[PDB]
Symmetry: C2
Subunit: 323 residues, 2 copies
């Protein structure tokens, strides 16, 4: 109960330092901004142009984009996760605490990412939305356990890591969409990436305050979380066909450079820096041991070739792409 009551005092602090990173709803983009306008005369031409540009984008890029989209559409899970955490749990479903307001507003923001990408993929005609839709249903039913243990310390370190990861992913899919000739798609991934950046900023800011107030508790938390490993939110991906769907998806994302094990370590190196775990002093014997583990981890991961096989993906009608 002492790590829990910490969060009720920070309620007002959160209003001023965290909630400021949400975009007010009137100022928020909506999927429709980046999609063929079904109320205009140019609808049919906009859709024809989209599908025409989509033919020039290779299947492997689509496999990765799809995977990222699925990850997004599993949103209910991530709101639930947030409400497992002890100081921030929405008690009623419309609680007026800062932490609850964030949780709901963050959710409302992330909801547009899936919506936009879903329609884009639908219109493209380059993927099987039936199998994608089924994958999503498995994923939501499946849930996800990040092993944050109801601890806001673990939880917000986790979300911090996750937000930066999606920032990198969406960022790279934006880059490669330009490279394949589709700037409208590049815009979609870029705008989404920009949202994730605001979320990263807010979540890293919470952990910064936690490192200020309770540095011992927060390095130990940070050590615990890396010891367990950061479990990815879509690790339980399943399409009813491939038992190793996540690994096969991750492998295409690795090859294309959308998300690599390098990017994993780079994120951890960033978070060590951003929280100045590096220069933390006056810790318990445990706290110091945790500090070491954390700081030495990124080079140790980075330390740890060729023609890969082709693999069919039900998301693209079992057509094959390299791994």
């Amino acid at each position: 109960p002492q790590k829990i009551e910490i969060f009720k005092s920070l309620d007002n602090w959160a209003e001023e330092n965290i909630l400021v990173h949400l975009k007010p709803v009137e100022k928020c983009w909506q999927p429709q901004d980046f999609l063929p306008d079904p109320a205009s005369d140019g609808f049919d031409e906009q859709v024809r142009e989209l599908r025409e540009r989509a033919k020039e984008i290779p299947d492997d890029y689509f496999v990765v984009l799809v995977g990222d989209m699925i990850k997004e559409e599993a949103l209910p899970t991530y709101q639930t996760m947030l409400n497992t955490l002890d100081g921030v749990r929405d008690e009623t479903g419309a609680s007026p605490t800062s932490w609850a307001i964030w949780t709901r507003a963050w959710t409302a923001e992330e909801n547009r990412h899936g919506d936009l990408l879903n329609k884009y993929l639908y219109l493209s005609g380059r993927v099987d939305m039936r199998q994608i839709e089924k994958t999503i249903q498995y994923l939501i039913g499946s849930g996800m356990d990040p092993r944050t243990e109801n601890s806001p310390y673990l939880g917000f370190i986790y979300t911090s890591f996750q937000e930066r990861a999606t920032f990198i992913e969406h960022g790279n899919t934006a880059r490669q969409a330009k490279e394949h000739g589709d700037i409208k798609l590049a815009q979609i991934c870029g705008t989404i990436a920009a949202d994730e950046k605001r979320h990263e900023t807010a979540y890293t800011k919470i952990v910064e305050k936690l490192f200020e107030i309770d540095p011992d508790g927060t390095v130990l938390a940070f050590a615990d979380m890396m010891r367990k490993k950061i479990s990815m939110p879509a690790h339980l991906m399943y399409d009813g066909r491939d038992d190793n769907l996540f690994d096969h998806f991750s492998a295409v994302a690795q090859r294309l450079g959308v998300y690599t094990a390098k990017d994993y370590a780079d994120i951890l190196e960033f978070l060590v820096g951003r929280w100045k775990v590096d220069k933390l002093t006056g810790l318990s014997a445990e706290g110091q041991k945790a500090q070491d583990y954390v700081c030495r981890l990124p080079p140790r991961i980075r330390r740890l070739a060729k023609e890969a096989p082709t693999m069919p993906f039900s998301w693209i009608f079992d057509r094959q792409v390299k791994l």
Copy 2:
């Protein structure tokens, strides 16, 4: 106490509740009811959809949109379920029956919003920007059903809510035939069919609760009706209309998609389905609760017959969901 009751019923739930989920491989997917973007007939299928959509009036669309928005607010309803004391998913992937249900239920409901969303998108008859914005408000806004962490209140509530969506989606299916669109009718009907399974499961839980603890469960049922069943989309807002929910509910009332009659008919059904009617050996409080509940449905029907008698013009009203075009209230 009321919490430990649910950890015993874990195994019972596996056999009597989880059986009402459709296995994922046997589930329809929005793509089944939509133009296939991978076929050559895509452009024709879309042209046909939009052509049929022109013959559907604006007022039906206002109601369909409102129901679609209600659906797309799904994250909220999963959260609600996880506020309840005996059923809360502790980890986010808890293997308890109640948690498996919560997630699977959510996964099922998700296809309802997806499907309707793309339909409305393709129709070209609505402003998806304002709809999208309304949804963002709605999710940020949350919803408090005043179930108080009680699974007794909670599942009574969901039971009521599931039957309501069954009726709504059901009626929008009927009226889509009447306006010439069977493919839309099919969409609403397939969704309605899912809600029916959910209703059945939720009513089944409360039935067991009325068996084990009849005193606790009538009191819960009275509590919930005394408060009134607060609708999940009551906080609807598009950044323009401060009375958006009432104005939406009014069009749905006029069109007969959901009326105060249907409210009472639901309550009369649930009184019957749970046999609150023939419950015996209750506390003095339990008996008072039993009375209130059973006398309520005719009351409501009386008060509505009177309300219809003194109706205050009902103007036309603009809706941002249809580019501020106007429809009667």
